Symmetry: D2
Subunit: 323 residues, 4 copies
């Protein structure tokens, strides 16, 4: 098979950051990535603009420099590739990790392509592969999406967005610009505080001009092939509808985490894996986590700017157990 000192699952920004810092401390690493590096950013909507300036998205002392104040999706793609190039990272792409088992102070990794054995393990699988379940009648119709890519094809289509965070407001602005008839249905009373303060004004101006319908305290009750039905303050309303974007968030793959022996916890920030806040070691010895996997659900506690510092934390602890 293959024997590597350390393996990292996930080549997102926090996984990449983990490999660099371990390499800086002389630990030979291998990143195993289900897609290619930073698939998450690759799957952003085409025109997405980050909300961090780009120095705050940079990892391992390769500067992320762009003329705009905030960088776009494709600039991050070009940046993180250069990071891999510059740090000479060993990346196994298009190889999904399917099973991890610990065996006599060693890990046994089974992927869709090979079998590996390693001493240190780092799970940076993030949360984007598992979208929250909608739970209304019709939530499985193919007209329902949990991801937004481009708005052009929904030109002159009656579209509904369920949810109220940055994904919801981003998609509605883009869909309105492309000629969809957009209805946002949000179950809260007022705009979520996590919508970034320099975006909400562009969205709110359009709802005031009767160009987008914004409904608060709205819960969707039924989705058919050509209608959506929602209730507001008890009152049920039914509107014609061609497509539904369920922008209701994501969550980590807990099945995968449990099957390696990692515990769920429920504490200050919700259901999170068990880990040593000071070193990021989990209950399974020599198994670390990095990235938004450490936060759990609340997609506003850990992003790239804080998550990229895990790797350095992991490196100190991994180097320490080298007596």
């Amino acid at each position: 098979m293959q024997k590597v000192e350390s393996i990292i699952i996930g080549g997102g920004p926090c996984g990449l950051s983990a490999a660099i810092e371990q390499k800086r401390k002389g630990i030979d690493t291998l990143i195993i990535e289900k897609g290619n590096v930073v698939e998450s950013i690759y799957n952003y909507p085409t025109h997405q603009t980050f909300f961090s300036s780009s120095d705050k998205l940079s990892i391992g002392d390769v500067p992320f420099i762009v003329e705009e104040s905030k960088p776009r999706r494709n600039q991050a793609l070009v940046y993180y590739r250069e990071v891999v190039k510059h740090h000479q990272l060993k990346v196994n792409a298009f190889e999904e990790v399917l099973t991890v088992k610990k065996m006599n102070n060693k890990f046994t990794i089974t992927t869709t392509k090979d079998v590996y054995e390693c001493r240190f393990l780092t799970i940076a699988t993030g949360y984007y592969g598992q979208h929250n379940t909608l739970e209304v009648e019709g939530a499985d119709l193919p007209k329902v999406f949990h991801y937004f890519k481009e708005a052009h094809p929904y030109f002159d289509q009656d579209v509904v967005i369920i949810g109220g965070k940055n994904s919801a407001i981003d998609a509605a602005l883009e869909l309105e610009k492309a000629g969809a008839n957009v209805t946002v249905l949000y179950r809260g009373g007022d705009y979520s505080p996590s919508i970034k303060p320099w975006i909400l004004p562009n969205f709110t101006a359009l709802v005031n001009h009767e160009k987008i319908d914004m409904e608060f305290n709205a819960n969707v009750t039924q989705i058919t092939e050509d209608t959506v039905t929602y209730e507001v303050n008890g009152e049920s309303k039914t509107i014609h509808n061609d497509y539904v974007f369920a922008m209701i968030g994501y969550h980590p793959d807990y099945e995968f985490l449990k099957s390696v022996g990692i515990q769920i916890n429920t504490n200050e920030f919700g259901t999170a894996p068990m880990y040593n806040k000071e070193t990021y070691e989990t209950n399974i010895e020599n198994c670390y986590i990095a990235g938004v996997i450490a936060a759990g659900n609340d997609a506003n506690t850990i992003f790239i700017e804080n998550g990229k510092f895990h790797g350095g934390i992991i490196a100190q602890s991994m180097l320490a157990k080298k007596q």
Copy 2:
């Protein structure tokens, strides 16, 4: 059922132009589009730049104005949508025509959503949905694509491009920029003349700096999941290969075209459908074609710049038959 004077199958640029021009002659028309309007352009590679200046893509008295010299893919999308808004065109999107039958002096159109009855029929389906077949061992593996979209995921992958015209050279530049190891295998003796003269220098410079492998007189003989084997002057070579981009062109849906009763016609121009060069009417009375479909095989006869003129021709002939 549904009764319309005129139906146009295809909401690409040529379909749209045909609708405008018929409407200008007092003909009530309906576009039935399997996707949404200008799906073709919607399915271009993401960062694609047109080779036409943008005055030459403009249709139906809506000026296409951009600050760049040649427009990018997303600008055309914004533009063609506005064309539909301005000209109040009826487009039934996400509705594939499945069957056309002639009965008395009326056509009966069966789609995935309804049945229509019309006097005049205009097939503007273009050729991008039907790719030329590779015809080598391994062409059905999932590592073989006939459409290029974005290059990032092929970062650090060993990629082979089959073909020689603008699709191959566009995709090679984009894949090289994204850090792939690109090998172009072209069955010709020299660069195809139809590659645009302001792109080619960017390709050859990278070729001359040994950044892309370019092979002439090369025919691919086998594709396995991790190799490609091709012949050059009889000599066989086998190189490791992760993905294959078969940029060998596209062709009209001749099955659908025959199933309505239209004759295929062996010309010394490239075997195309039967049509009156002066009116674009087929062998079936009141059934016209417009767009690149009238070119047949070669794709250097009809593009948007001239193909957008069929509409004006067809409208005259339909008006001659009156109503």
Copy 3:
């Protein structure tokens, strides 16, 4: 000399707008523009982003279409030229009007290039060309600018911005992004309400992170070659300083407006010329005004969006007067 029915001083969007609508009524016009068309937009800062969507900046039967939400400076430049091209407008560029006198029912216009005589006259000279006078010691130093263009050359220079409106806040973000040490000195107590609600948060963040110095209740008292001295509620502070941006607003050339015989007003809200409100005719018979020059009495501002509608009103009144 030269004899034209109607003359328009000013080829900004509102001057151009007046010409199109008068021409639509079969009235011959000539635009005399001190620069070339839309010089004002041309003298915007290089990277300036309009605050309107681009349909609200469109004039005269030419759609303003862009893929972004709000268009950039050069997109409007490209656009307003096509408006002139499409409407075949006579424009005499690089010709400043210096002198207007009434004799009979006829005007005699004296420019730096010719002498003109016309029946209808429209003064659409806007306000961007005459900056408010600073009125501090040192305001004549060459280090004092009343216009912002690009920020690069102020890299690692100590810069002061006088003012607190959109010009001041835009210029500060640009200068900070380019590495200047920026101090904004504003004579008010809080952020001006006219700062766009989607821009302010980016500025506010930089102030809170000590990347820009923001001083309220700040009045500048002296500018020397290498210091700036200001008072904050009376206490004097003096800082090292390399350049000064007095973004303290603009005003129409009222000198020119009186020198033809038009009364100003100065009343409560502001200070504007006399005009009929229903025709936009001034106290001088057959003398109209258009554009932001008409702002001042009314408790509203005039941007391109509402100001461009003057032209239509003007055309009717000129159409009533026949001739």
Copy 4:
């Protein structure tokens, strides 16, 4: 009155490269830049696109990374500012060096702000600040420019471009897209080979579609207030003309080079300073040159790509001379 070990005159890319390389070897450096860093690039036409990929513009191990194939002008500005920050280079901006004289183990440098005294001097003044003399009647009219910035204000004006290299060809394209009536007058027989091969096809298409006038073997004889008169193989022609773009090249400031005591000496290829090819030291001990100024006699061209390597070679010779 101020004392530094080494001084570099010129803060363009090759000067900056010199400072980094000297700093890597422990030499105290100071850049004196008449403008701010990379003023030459700052004075490019607003929309200039480099012809180098951006890897080749990188200096001192700060990677220049951009999503597009060739970088634009403002990206080069953003990058070179980040190099100065990243290495912490001392740059005294807006301080023109007027005089250098040799005295003892020291140079005495006179600028418009101070006097310096140093051991090592590196003159990296480039050529973009000194335009070749036009030397025809009218070359001093204000309608004659030796620098191109933006094309919009020349909308619908009669423009003449003198020259035949990329500056002329770039300017013609930018001036044609903005609606000028462009006549390029070149004293040569055919297109200059130095025009980049992916740009020439865009100009040629415009010449062939009679939208730009291109005249070969044309020499300009007179510039009047509103005409230009040129001879083509002796035949005289006179055309109406509003502005003149003398894109006839540039040259290093050779007086300044002589006034320090460095010998210039012309050949084939041109005139260059006298210097050792292995150390880049001039005839004056401890006075080096860097950048395109070293071009002239070598029959080789010096761009940012090759010119940026002087600094390292110069650092060796300076370090060899020890302390």
